[PDB]
């Protein structure tokens, strides 16, 4: 036996990265996974190198961040790497989920994987938000206030749970210290969920664009897909360098560089770009409780997607109507995100309500109806 297969650690590394039998037909969309891992890694690294100079205290938080920017060697680089890497992590995750939906990697054999992925997604945003509250800029403070107020909507426990999470009667030093600790940790719990996701993948292997069994033609992860992962990693790092060095603050919001004070409310309390699609829903639903319920449903309905997808064919590469519906869903999602950052204007409020309606209708109507109609069309076409 080769040493890479006898030794337990090298055996695991082999099973996952060297002789992992990936389908030969997987295109570059299947390299996002590893990319996401890299993103997580870099975030953690940057995060650690920020924890060494960041101060969790409310009065020292923003000043400590500026100390990192102005006084710490390479502190600006690490700060921007972390901030823009959050956005890039979510870009990779959104493309990850888009690939999963398009190529039907959410169907029966990997439903378990799907579920884990969904959890990770939620956890990730509940780590991103936390991080955004650490700098304690105007947007940071008011986003924390808005979210914690929304948590008050729960009838039986919402009246007193909000002080419980705050550590006080409003967002203050206990809140920022709590968010710092939970934000340093929750990514490390997510590192465990990532391993769980990888094992749930490894049990049944990875899908392929054609949506058929990959067992007919499998290739080892190494060298082929290792080098494809290298290509996508270098492309990702090149675009990441573009943003970090030549345009870092475009993804962020300028108001976050204003020291936060509860007495002054900014003209527009809006999340970073990649929370916009969800916050849009939170803006559209009148009831606060209903709003938060719909906001979390917009993610959790991914769990119902595998059961609402009555298609007998994996993926959409060979499915006209399914591809059309998926692309319309993607553009509706982009429109919802865009509406997320705008004020509450008439056409925008009605359009946000309609966009949320169609976003949920996708999962609960279109995928079932379209999938059944396409199965019928396939059979009644080939029947001749």
């Amino acid at each position: 036996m080769p040493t890479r297969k006898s030794n337990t650690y090298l055996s695991l590394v082999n099973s996952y990265l060297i002789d992992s039998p990936q389908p030969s037909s997987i295109n570059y969309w299947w390299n996002l996974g590893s990319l996401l891992g890299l993103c997580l890694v870099i975030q953690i690294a940057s995060g650690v190198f920020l924890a060494m100079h960041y101060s969790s205290n409310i009065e020292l938080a923003f000043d400590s961040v500026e100390h990192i920017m102005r006084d710490v060697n390479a502190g600006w680089l690490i700060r921007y790497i972390h901030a823009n890497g959050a956005s890039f992590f979510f870009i990779c995750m959104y493309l990850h989920i888009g690939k999963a939906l398009y190529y039907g990697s959410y169907k029966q054999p990997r439903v378990m994987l799907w579920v884990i992925g969904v959890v990770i997604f939620i956890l990730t945003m509940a780590i991103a938000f936390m991080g955004y509250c650490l700098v304690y800029g105007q947007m940071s403070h008011w986003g924390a206030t808005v979210i914690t107020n929304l948590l008050s909507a729960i009838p039986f426990i919402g009246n007193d749970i909000v002080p419980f999470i705050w550590g006080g009667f409003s967002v203050s030093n206990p809140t920022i210290q709590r968010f710092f600790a939970l934000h340093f940790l929750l990514p490390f719990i997510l590192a465990a969920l990532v391993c769980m996701h990888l094992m749930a993948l490894h049990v049944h292997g990875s899908s392929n664009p054609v949506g058929i069994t990959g067992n007919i033609d499998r290739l080892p992860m190494h060298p082929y897909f290792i080098f494809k992962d290298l290509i996508t990693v270098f492309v990702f790092l090149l675009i990441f360098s573009l943003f970090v060095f030549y345009s870092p603050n475009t993804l962020g919001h300028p108001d976050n560089y204003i020291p936060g004070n509860p007495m002054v409310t900014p003209p527009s309390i809006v999340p970073e770009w990649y929370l916009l699609p969800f916050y849009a829903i939170l803006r559209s639903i009148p009831d606060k409780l209903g709003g938060v319920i719909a906001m979390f449903g917009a993610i959790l309905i991914l769990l119902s997607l595998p059961y609402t997808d009555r298609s007998i064919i994996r993926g959409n590469s060979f499915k006209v109507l399914s591809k059309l519906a998926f692309y319309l869903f993607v553009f509706n999602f982009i429109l919802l995100g865009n509406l997320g950052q705008l004020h509450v204007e008439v056409p925008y409020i009605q359009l946000g309500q309609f966009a949320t309606a169609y976003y949920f209708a996708h999962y609960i109507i279109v995928v079932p109806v379209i999938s059944t109609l396409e199965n019928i069309l396939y059979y009644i076409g080939t029947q001749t």
Binding site: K228, L237, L238, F245, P254, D255
Partner: protein, 243 residues
């Protein structure tokens, strides 16, 4: 509303704009001079220390002299005897007002925000500052009403701003002989404030250039190596010959 969002400032072709362009440190020194001469009356720059100017806009001796001019709160002899000391390079530049109400009462209630981060904390950054300083029209647009102790400047959100135009022509005597026009002073001040908000700008862009070069080389090499490794599979053929 158009007014509430504030007029969007145009994109001037800054000498420092562009991927490989660095700050015009002559303009940075001009802007620092204008700030010290004019903006120091209203706005503080707490997050900029004299040490930051060395090698940027002032020789170590010059910054040393400027710091020594000022008196800073020395650590009182722990017998509670308060005293002042000459400033050092490590001391942060003082603001005109010790605390907020001093400014507000001095400024009819409005608080001149710290400029050490204003460029990063406003849409358009340097363009916004330059337009705002030069945005004040001689006569406000007809029909608008200005509260007492307020001035109109369209680039400000809401149109009504507490600051009146301060960069009047030929205000400061530039030590380099450059004309001290209001536009020139506004450009210099905007460049200085952009440096203050992004002191790493020069090094940031240089490191970006290095990173782009290295990563582009790696990316091209990885494309070549991948197409390489995949030629056997790309060129793979099959034949299927049952009876």
């Amino acid at each position: 509303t158009a007014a509430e969002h504030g007029l969007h400032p145009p994109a001037y072709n800054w000498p420092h704009n562009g991927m490989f362009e660095t700050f015009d440190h002559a303009s940075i020194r001009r802007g620092f001079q204008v700030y010290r001469e004019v903006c120091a009356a209203c706005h503080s720059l707490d997050r900029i220390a004299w040490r930051n100017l060395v090698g940027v806009s002032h020789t170590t001796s010059e910054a040393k002299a400027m710091a020594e001019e000022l008196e800073y709160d020395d650590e009182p002899d722990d017998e509670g005897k308060p005293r002042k000391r000459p400033g050092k390079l490590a001391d942060y530049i003082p603001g005109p007002y010790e605390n907020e109400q001093a400014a507000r009462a001095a400024n009819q209630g409005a608080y001149p925000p710290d400029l050490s981060l204003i460029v990063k904390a406003r849409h358009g950054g340097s363009d916004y500052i330059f337009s705002l300083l030069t945005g004040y029209p001689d006569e406000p647009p007809a029909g608008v009403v200005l509260p007492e102790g307020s001035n109109y400047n369209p680039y400000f959100p809401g149109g009504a701003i507490a600051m009146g135009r301060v960069l009047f022509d030929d205000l400061v005597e530039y030590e380099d002989g450059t004309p001290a026009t209001t536009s020139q002073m506004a450009k210099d001040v905007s460049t200085f404030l952009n440096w203050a908000s992004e002191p790493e700008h020069d090094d940031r862009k240089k490191w970006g250039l290095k990173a782009l070069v290295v990563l582009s080389s790696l990316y091209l090499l990885s494309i070549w190596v991948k197409r390489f490794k995949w030629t056997p599979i790309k060129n793979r053929k099959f034949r299927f010959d049952p009876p």
